[PDB]
């Protein structure tokens, strides 16, 4: 018998740094859901996402959700540095009753909801250089209002336009005004986008409205960090092979517990 057919039902917290997600996904902890503010600037070798995870802030969606989840998971960190973005002429710190924090209306801790100032929204053109040695990850959004009445009362323009560019890429988004099913009694939505800036490069953001602005950047790292979906409890042991069903020993050259593995694991075989 040289095929590993069983596991201990637990993920050992050693030797890899395990970060349990509890009720939070990696993207929600990235944006700054009030329930996920305990995960700020935390590091990991394997992020464990649970099936009980749920969002509890402003309803949003991420075009290409898997790639942003994979890119941040393969970085193994949530370290965030605030940058002095100069939004002169607009209102900041937008909050919502769907994003409660400390029994008060709030918003994503990493995002800045910009609206008009006295029914004027000047064309914001801001430039943020990266004079560092690492890569910066900027998370920004586009707000999609329900009606044209809200479009005007939020941004004082019948339609906004957002352009985030570097010397290498360009991202241009037009908001889509319309009704959507009410999530936490909110029929508007936010679309999340990301941009990577390299050393010597500059972040350029042009917006005439509907911009969910960043408050800074996440540091990007390279390593063997990853993410895994599992409802197995985390335990006090040591094992260099993790599967969603728990840690398995790596004695046998084969295993049939599950294909998704992390670390130095045996090869997978079907069977049962």
């Amino acid at each position, epitope marked *: 018998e040289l095929v590993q057919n069983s596991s201990i039902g637990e993920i050992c917290d050693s030797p890899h740094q395990i970060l349990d997600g509890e009720n939070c996904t990696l993207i929600d902890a990235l944006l700054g859901d009030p329930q996920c503010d305990g995960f700020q600037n935390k590091k990991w070798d394997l992020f464990v996402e649970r099936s009980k995870a749920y969002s509890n802030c402003y309803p949003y969606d991420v075009p290409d959700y898997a790639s942003l989840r994979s890119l941040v998971a393969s970085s193994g960190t949530l370290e965030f540095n605030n940058e002095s973005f100069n939004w002169n002429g607009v209102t900041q*710190n937008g909050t919502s009753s769907a994003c409660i924090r400390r029994s008060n209306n709030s918003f994503f801790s990493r995002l800045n909801w910009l609206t008009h100032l*006295n029914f004027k929204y000047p064309a914001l053109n801001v430039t943020m250089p990266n004079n560092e040695q690492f890569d910066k990850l900027y998370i920004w959004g586009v*707000h999609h209002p329900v009606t044209d009445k809200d479009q005007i009362f939020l941004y004082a323009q019948p339609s906004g336009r957002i352009t985030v560019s570097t010397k290498r890429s360009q991202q241009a988004v037009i908001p889509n005004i319309g009704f959507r099913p009410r999530i936490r009694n909110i029929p508007s939505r936010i679309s999340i986008y990301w941009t990577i800036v390299k050393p010597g490069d500059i972040l350029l953001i042009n917006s005439t409205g509907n911009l969910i602005a960043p408050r800074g950047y996440f540091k990007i790292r390279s390593g063997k960090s990853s993410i895994m979906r599992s409802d197995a409890p985390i335990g006090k042991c040591k094992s260099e092979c993790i599967t969603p069903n728990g840690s398995i020993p790596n004695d046998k050259p084969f295993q049939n517990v599950n294909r998704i593995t992390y670390g130095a694991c045996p090869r997978y075989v079907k069977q049962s």
Partner: antibody
Amino acid sequence: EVQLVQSGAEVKKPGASVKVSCKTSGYTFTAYYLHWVRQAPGQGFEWMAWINPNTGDTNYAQKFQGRVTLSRDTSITTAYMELTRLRSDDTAVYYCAKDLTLMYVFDSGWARGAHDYYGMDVWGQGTTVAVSG
Amino acid sequence: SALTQPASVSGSPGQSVTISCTGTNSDVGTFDLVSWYQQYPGKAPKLIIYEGSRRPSGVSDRFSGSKSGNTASLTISGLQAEDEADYYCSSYAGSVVFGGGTKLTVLG
């Protein structure tokens, strides 16, 4: 057209209480702060208090705290100001004024992070209250 | 916690007048939340200048606002007979504060 129609002129005796109404129209009543400021005969303006018609929160001036009470009626978009223990020094014209800063957009679920005071863009015609013994 | 204005200002038709509005600090000399109001005898005030230098739609371009250090200023050029009124500045210095009021006379 934004309109603030106030109640009629009042003639009260000292020690009594007066309550002035302010019916709004032409805008979302619960989306802007509503101020109350008085002007004594021959003097300048003196801010008394404001109220958040959405939540009911108030902010009275230290000189008026304990004697004035602000309230609203969202159904008729009317706000009220009541002054108790009237003085001869309370004789003035009392104005309700709408604040400039928009603070709520309900259907998109937006609430302004903090209130900033930029001015009062629409005023009521004023309510004259004379307090004589 | 107060704003000071000149009690009275005067000018002839066609000239320019300036009404100052001085405070302390943490108001007119940190935040420009300064608004100006025109009031006719027995009438409700009317906002004529907000954000220090911005003018609501419908107010004549002859009115303008400018700051310095801890003072604000309202300038009325091309003075007319109908410009005679009391002018108040207001801002926020712990609470909503008003100036004492300036009576502007157009010398006839």
